[PDB]
Design a protein around this ligand. Structure first.
Ligand SMILES: Cc1ncc(C[n+]2csc(CCOP(=O)(O)OP(=O)(O)O)c2C)c(N)n1
Ligand SMILES: Cc1ncc(C[n+]2csc(CCOP(=O)(O)OP(=O)(O)O)c2C)c(N)n1
Ligand SMILES: O=C(CO)[C@@H](O)[C@H](O)[C@H](O)COP(=O)(O)O
Ligand SMILES: O=C(CO)[C@@H](O)[C@H](O)[C@H](O)COP(=O)(O)O
Ligand SMILES: [Ca+2]
Ligand SMILES: [Ca+2]
Lengths: 676, 676
């Protein structure tokens, strides 16, 4: 008889009807988690009319297949999502896709569905909130005091990425994070008894999490609310709330794996409706008493945001500098002329490894841009990712840092680092955050990297030791396929800078980015400062480094192979062959230039040879012939590896001469040309 | 004064001298783990003169950067690895690469170095041993009773893949597995206090592992041996032995992160040698008392193998059928004419999804080929990877299966499944093992997949839901980059079969493979049986499906797009354009054919258009123009997605007609031609 009971029924039946309309999707977890969703959203502070309010509590559905539940909450609370949108669940072009997308769904903080990701994103949102609060809060000014609420299931708990992030979140004492395990004993294959018998609670205690168990989460919303209150009292541990639920609660098939991921039968939906007091002939029913009850909570939350806006106005009066910084960040704007801090080099400067140039850039721009934070996956002395004079992000209680710190010790946790970076970006406030590892092990985090791209998050991988140039660690460490993989992923900027100026351009792009993740492929070995490079020119993604009006061939190269191309040009000169050189530090940035610009760099009428010491995949977009490395590497001194594979001035010159011969007497059009 | 002490010193100094000769590598963990390595190898049964003895104990160095330790053991025990090879540590072309490679190093069971992988490989070796023993052991015939010993460090314990595999190994009660944690409190960034403060022991107990703690693993080899004995008494739990060690034990820099990954200073090496009784002027010292002591253990082990060979001879007398099966498997040979079990289709048969065709193949070949085992990462009802009438691999104690079972419930653990598959292959005995998930989430396991390729292991991914064809789950589930990523990786066979006959060819390749991992990209949606397909023709990787002697264009396609290409051919016919069709179910298999065969499929003098509903990367090897999908997908009904992106007979025909126009009046040579 209570409106709470009616709301829970409404949520359950909206979710079931959405799945029924699509004849596709997942009704089980929505039915089991509706009580908890109702309780959690009633405790959350949010404004459906301002999804960007920086002191909102955040909600993350890590078990993203359950998104009919999320969409039902967003509709009932009056986000920019309607019952008509629910009726278009899983339909082409709708705002209710089969897994939630932050780019398409108002109130979806992150893109989830791939299991394990959301809980790690929640760790990142909570990490950002802690850093943000430590940076801006003052006595009598709680600018940031929000919580991060995550729903997750058994699948998320089995995925290693969540173990990584949970270990780290416990270490970081993130008391702002409250996660809820849907303990329903069912996965796709059937009972969890067949593959998942670990003592989850004991594991989470071993990470340093607090635990609250709710033995009847099907009905006991008082206990769920009390569990949230208890979690909030434990300020130095993230909390896991165990929700013991019946998957598909109410269905004839409740408590079975069949209700996990298929639409319910028509008669099942009828009996669900009738026993909960709804009309079995009606779909998408919304009792006005439910939206009125919810509208009241919205009104209270809107009053809280109104007061927060006055708090912020008073803060800007008392702390004009910090307040202006905060306003700028909330407006999405970097500091004026921040890029004047970028290092600039000339050909008179010494050769430097681009991982070391990266260290230098970070040391200059971190002091100038407070919204840069980042870390490394236990490779700080090798990636060179920490700026001297910064403090690590740690709980002060440890003595090892502070929450105001700017450098994160991720440990050996590449995948969670990638998904945590997504959460930090998702927090907002213009965070431009980065994560260091060896390029070859960015691949450990592929699940998260592709979601950076799909989510349009401006995260940055500082991906060092990019090739066989690293030498002795050998083929287990040497990328071959890696750049092809990420360049083939839509919306990833993959920078491979050749020298100091190009490394500054790469960081200019990565930090200015608002919608595109970056991977910066950086060398262990020293590279010369190039004649002809500049930040301005490299900012175009691809540019003419050596212009040769009478070119017999153009060599297009990236990174460490640009200097090699220039040396090959000198060899070719002695053989009577004139070459130009194009440097292509980022293929995506280049692709986005005008057709006329791109054709000025890669014109018609001249054969083009690409040179890059890894896969030739993708390179036929830019070249007629490709010199790359399509086998695994080798353990040895790097110069000897390059000699073995003929990535030498003479070996490049030989293949350039063969390319010129191949096209002798034939017209050649730019590789940029296509039939459609 | 004991020879044990002298052996430990010898091991330590061989490792340090190897690193010193290379001026590259990792001396710290070798110094800390030499006592444990000495103790473990003394308990292990192995034959340095027969690295394939199927009842050997296996050793895995998961902390593979410590490989100077492994190489020192292999040299001292008289494997096909010498002191001269140690002097060439980390040098181009040596048998002592900077991380161990099973393809290059005698006695290296797997390729390790990428952290977390080795312990998961050990779980797989132990899983295979349990299955193998349950299949072949009889009363009085312990054909298989070997153990799997793994060394791992803090890094491995932080990588999520090891959590996945450890949860599963505990569930599977793998009492044959004994792992050793190098608890030295140091990672690359410094103390583990900065990022890794979890209660490891409590976590491993939560998985159901047994624990033995060795508080002084720097010196107490009696306690290490006793820990092994204790582990062997606990037959229903894998055991974690906590080795509390001093990283770099003996170095002036012992117990610091500087000794982790850089050569020791010359004076440090001198004082190490002098205080342990060695000559500081001598490198690569091997006291004859150490190799004599080790040679005795080898002799005992060789006697054990000699007896095992007689046991096996007696087994073949008593159980001629099982014995002949076992002999065949140990010879590396599949059953005679096993491939007669492969299903064959004609164009009169119904349309079938290739994931369903895969189910049918498995149902026919699993009964015929006992060395096939496999599983799914909690997608069994969606991948269709279990053959009816088989039992799950589980401990009998659970009631859910038996160790003789053939179907593995991996849970939602793609990355560990990939690395466990590598371990099962590494066990030997001709295991041909497979793992099912959605293609898009094979990417979660990229770290392990690339090691399958580098290790030359014939594992198979059953990778369903391969494209936008899956429909409503949307872009979080729909591959775009995935095939490009794995095709760009050396030595991966990436099959994308178009119909029944091609799906049988893909399995023929995957099961016959001895050195090449396979990924089978399979559809959710139904595809027609093609006129012109056959197992024989598809076994060539690429073949002419529709031969058109007067072709204006050839359309080359894979998988679901072959039928689309054939329908486009019909549209083109009405526009006066003659097309041929090539089906390219595996690019690697095709690439390995003769140049004349490849040119017969992709000849000179005709424009070639590729069609595949994902990245166009790689396709310029085979086509002049490429029609693919280089943006993310969409949540909707699959046919509507295909229409939106113009993957329709008319849309393909339009781009084919534009391709013909583009080359009108120009000579065209095969894309297979290259200048070098
Ligand atoms: C990384 C990843 N692996 C596999 C899947 C496929 N998948 C979707 S739901 C699911 C089962 C999820 O189980 P659980 O999280 O317990 O959800 P519940 O059945 O309780 O609703 C699986 C294996 C996925 N979406 N992401
Ligand atoms: C997946 C992966 N991430 C990072 C690295 C780089 N790396 C090599 S060793 C190492 C530290 C390993 O620490 P630990 O395993 O504790 O070895 P120890 O310092 O005790 O010798 C790291 C981060 C790697 N090899 N593989
Ligand atoms: O990953 C590893 C070991 O698996 C190595 O790379 C070292 O641990 C260290 O990172 C050496 O790298 P450099 O900084 O000397 O190039
Ligand atoms: O992964 C998911 C949810 O994240 C879905 O794919 C379902 O869990 C199920 O696998 C449906 O797939 P179908 O078998 O109906 O195609
Ligand atoms: Ca579940
Ligand atoms: Ca360590």
């Amino acid at each position: 008889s209570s409106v709470d009971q009616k709301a829970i029924s409404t949520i359950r039946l909206l979710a079931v009807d959405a799945v029924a309309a699509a004849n596709s999707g997942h009704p089980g977890a929505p039915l089991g988690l509706a009580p908890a969703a109702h309780a959690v959203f009633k405790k959350m502070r949010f404004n459906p009319k301002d999804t960007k309010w920086i002191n909102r509590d955040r909600f993350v559905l890590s078990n993203g297949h359950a998104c009919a539940l999320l969409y039902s909450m967003l509709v009932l609370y009056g986000y920019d999502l309607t019952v008509e949108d629910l009726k278009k669940f899983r339909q082409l072009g709708s705002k209710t896709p089969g897994h939630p997308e932050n780019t398409d769904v108002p109130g979806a903080e992150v893109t989830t569905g791939p299991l394990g990701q959301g809980i790690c994103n929640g760790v990142g949102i909570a990490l950002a909130q802690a850093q943000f609060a430590a940076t801006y809060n003052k006595p009598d000014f709680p600018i940031s005091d929000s919580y991060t609420y995550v729903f997750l299931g058994d699948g998320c708990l089995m995925e290693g990425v969540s173990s990584e992030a949970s270990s780290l979140a416990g270490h970081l004492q993130l008391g702002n994070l409250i996660a809820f395990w849907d303990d329903n004993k069912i996965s796709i294959d059937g009972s969890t008894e067949v593959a998942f018998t670990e003592d989850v609670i004991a594991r989470y205690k071993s990470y340093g999490w607090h635990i609250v168990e709710v033995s009847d989460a099907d009905t006991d919303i008082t206990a769920i609310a009390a569990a949230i209150d208890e979690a909030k009292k434990v300020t130095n541990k993230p909390t896991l709330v165990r929700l013991t639920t019946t998957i598909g609660f109410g269905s004839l098939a409740q408590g079975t794996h069949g209700v996990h991921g298929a639409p319910l039968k028509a008669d099942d939906i009828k009996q669900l409706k009738t026993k909960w007091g709804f009309n079995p002939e009606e779909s998408f029913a919304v009792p006005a008493e439910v939206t009125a009850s919810y509208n009241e909570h919205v009104a209270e939350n809107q009053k809280i945001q109104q007061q927060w806006n006055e708090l912020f106005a008073a803060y800007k009066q008392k702390y004009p500098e910090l307040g202006a910084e905060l306003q700028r960040r909330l407006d999405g704007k970097l500091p004026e002329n921040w890029d004047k801090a970028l290092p600039v080099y000339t050909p008179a400067d010494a050769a430097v490894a681009t991982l070391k140039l990266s260290e230098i850039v970070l040391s200059k721009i971190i002091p100038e841009v407070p919204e840069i934070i980042g870390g490394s996956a236990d490779l700080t002395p090798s990636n060179l990712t920490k700026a001297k004079g910064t403090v690590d992000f740690q709980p002060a209680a440890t003595g090892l840092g502070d929450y105001s710190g700017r450098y994160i010790r991720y440990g050996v946790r590449e995948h969670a680092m990638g998904a945590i970076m997504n959460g930090i970006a998702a927090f907002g406030a213009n965070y431009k955050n980065y994560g260091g590892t060896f390029l070859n092990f960015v691949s450990y985090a592929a699940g998260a990297v592709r979601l950076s791209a799909l989510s349009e998050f401006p995260i940055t991988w500082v991906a060092t030791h990019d090739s066989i140039g690293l030498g002795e660690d050998g083929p287990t460490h040497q990328p071959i396929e890696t750049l092809a993989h990420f360049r083939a992923t839509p919306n990833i900027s993959v920078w491979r800078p050749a020298d100091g100026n190009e490394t500054s351009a790469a960081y200019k792009s990565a930090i200015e980015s608002t919608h595109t993740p970056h991977i910066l492929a950086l060398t262990r070995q020293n590279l010369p400062q190039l004649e002809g490079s500049s930040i301005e020119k490299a900012s175009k993604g691809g540019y003419t480094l050596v212009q040769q009006d009478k070119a017999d061939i153009i060599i297009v190269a990236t990174g460490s192979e640009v200097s090699l191309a220039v040396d090959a040009l000198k060899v070719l000169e002695g053989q009577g062959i004139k070459a130009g050189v194009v440097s292509l530090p980022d293929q995506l940035t280049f692709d986005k230039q005008s057709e006329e610009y791109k054709l000025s760099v890669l014109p018609d009428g001249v054969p083009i040879l690409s040179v890059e010491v890894m896969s030739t995949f993708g390179w036929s977009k830019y070249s007629h012939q490709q010199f790359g490395l399509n086998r695994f590497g080798a353990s040895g001194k790097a110069p000897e590896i390059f000699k073995l594979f003929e990535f030498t001035p003479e070996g490049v010159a030989e293949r350039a001469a063969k390319t010129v011969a191949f096209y002798k007497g034939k017209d050649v059009v730019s590789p940029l040309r296509s039939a459609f």
